[PDB]
Symmetry: C3
Subunit: 286 residues, 3 copies
């Protein structure tokens, strides 16, 4: 049917946050599974648990803390979600994407979406960072789009375009800068496909997603990106390739959450250095 939040609910939450912190973020960063350590490098950090914040969705997941952290990252005013919400948990997409519109109302102009993802492109290795050039929204094709229902004109248009969702200039700048990281592995770029989960893919399903032209797969991110673009936010995205999706019947290996968290923790230092360089490539407001 429809979004349960009114415009006033988003506004009340934003105003509450603005009156309880001196921080005025330009960039919002959503931290994915095992990527919560990205909040460690924030200076002058102020923490809000989701339970404190009016209208915020309330449950957990292990690997995802449940807190909003305001601070400076490489001198840039940021707000960071440590713990995102997923459709597989039972949330409708208008709950999943609620914070994105809150960030818009806080005065954020840029959303950085991060996630763990399974590698579908065979040239990707575990520990690679893949810039999200584009996505395939499989749930969206069937009806599961966060904009379903009446459009709120105060956020955006009825029929927003998504062909330019992942900012071209930021990706070019992130690629050219990656020279400064001094890494053996080059920065990957490709298409993220969203599937609902929560179960991992079969071999046949992996091959479907490969045939469709997806380079990495996950269960998040796309709804947030749609809502961000709907309200005019610049969007940058990247995936940590935490595992190679099983694509043959001979293998005895199986995708599993423990391996996903481990890959996150092993890459944590490299992710923090990359997000630092990323802040320098973000245009200022106005």
């Amino acid at each position: 049917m429809e979004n349960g939040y009114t415009y006033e609910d988003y506004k009340n939450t934003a105003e509450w946050l603005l009156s309880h912190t001196k921080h005025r973020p330009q960039v919002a960063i959503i931290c994915g599974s095992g990527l919560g350590g990205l909040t460690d490098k924030l200076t002058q950090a102020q923490i809000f648990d989701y339970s404190e914040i009016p209208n915020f969705p309330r449950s957990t997941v292990p690997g995802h803390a449940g807190r909003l952290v305001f601070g400076f990252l490489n001198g840039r005013a940021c707000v960071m979600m440590q713990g995102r919400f997923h459709m597989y948990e039972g949330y409708p997409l208008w709950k999943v994407t609620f914070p994105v519109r809150v960030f818009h109302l806080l005065g954020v102009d840029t959303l950085v979406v991060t996630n763990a993802a399974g590698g579908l492109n065979p040239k990707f290795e575990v520990g690679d960072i893949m810039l999200i050039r584009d996505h395939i929204n499989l749930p969206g094709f069937s009806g599961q789009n966060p904009l379903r229902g009446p459009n709120d004109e105060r956020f955006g248009d009825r029929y927003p375009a998504m062909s330019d969702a992942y900012d071209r200039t930021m990706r070019q700048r992130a690629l050219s800068t990656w020279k400064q990281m001094g890494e053996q592995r080059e920065l990957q770029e490709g298409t993220y496909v969203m599937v609902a989960g929560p179960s991992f893919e079969t071999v046949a399903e992996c091959r479907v997603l490969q045939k469709l032209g997806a380079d990495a797969v996950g269960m998040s991110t796309v709804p947030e990106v749609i809502v961000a673009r709907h309200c005019g936010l610049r969007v940058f995205g990247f995936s940590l390739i935490t595992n190679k999706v099983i694509m043959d019947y001979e293998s005895l290996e199986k995708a599993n959450h423990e391996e996903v968290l481990a890959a996150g923790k092993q890459a944590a230092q490299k992710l923090e250095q990359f997000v630092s360089i990323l802040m320098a490539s973000i245009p200022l407001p106005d």
Copy 2:
């Protein structure tokens, strides 16, 4: 707990009987007008207008580019009823509301449903302003559960497991093609597969390429549910798309799909749509 149709058989019947007792018109053909195609009701003679708000059990709309009215009349001498303004899944309607009027038309005594829409071109040979005959569809929402027949089957309308391989009437499409060839028009009448996606946001480049790889020639957010319900209750079905824009299929382009361009393409093709709908009426069999 059980996901089912909220309308009873009696609700459809009450709406049909209400319409039949408030107009002298007895339509054979129902025509659903797509986005920017509402001007197709202008050529109706002896027109009688009902706003959807007047009609019992009818859904109440909310889209700009879609008026919200049922128009009875004669189109090229043929008794028609026309929907100016359809309902979409992206608006929040369940598919049993979206397709409600199709069963009403069946109960009015309509034997043919003409479905029209605006669509994005996926086939690179299509140009803006082309008319594509719908030979077939790909029902992506249907694969996942979003089918208008979900829930208990009403035997009074049709079977539990209706076939869709013959949904778009073969004879009407052949007649439309042969009649077009006789006109000696330079630009050909196109024919292809329509893929339904829910929307309401437009496709990414990667998504466009998915739909191309799947063998779709045009994409939109409607039509397929109506066609399924029509075929379920035995209606003959004819479909066509106005190609209102070419879907963005590369990352170099600065162009973006947008509603304003879609409406504009509709208005620009008005003359060509009227000539096409004229030939179309001639290709529809009379009742027994």
Copy 3:
């Protein structure tokens, strides 16, 4: 919050009710597909429960599906058989569709055998073929329709279960090698089952999509049960009866239809019973 309406206690109450109303203690659960209800005929010492008798069990009406649970022995192996499954197209949410699978787990079943009728997408399949399910494509699952959606119950399984090993490798190898004993002209087929919601049959363009995706057979069931089975640690074996060849060209005047599907089931019933008999012998014992 979109969640399972059953608590752990509901599953447990249903299992305990069944355990206290039959002396049978099944090791293997078998779900009978459309026109495959005759698989319950070879059960010895049979005890029948109608679904209406059983607490918390879903209730309602499809033709070709009886609506009963049958406990008994099949080739000397303790079985429980569903004659009549539930489908998403009927209006049931997937947590109702898959409810019996968790009940079987709590009865002490360690193996689920899933059977179905399916449309042939692979052109080498003929009507009457048995296709071993090596793998599946869960199209509804991609979009959100997964029976595990909502809070995970740790007492059944993990939050993020793997499905790449869903169809037991050893049982498929044993079923293939044994099929020699059946003495059939047609070899045992093996392939990928794609689930679509239905209830309407595929268009030609849709058939070609499913072929391009690498599916060998198509149906409207089975996959949700398999996911819930694997979530709670059950060994899973699956097969499809190819009841019709899906229409893949516009020249054909033939149309898929339920009557032809039921007829194909009844014609293959004897062969299915002999195959399920050999299948029970290839299932490992408990502990």
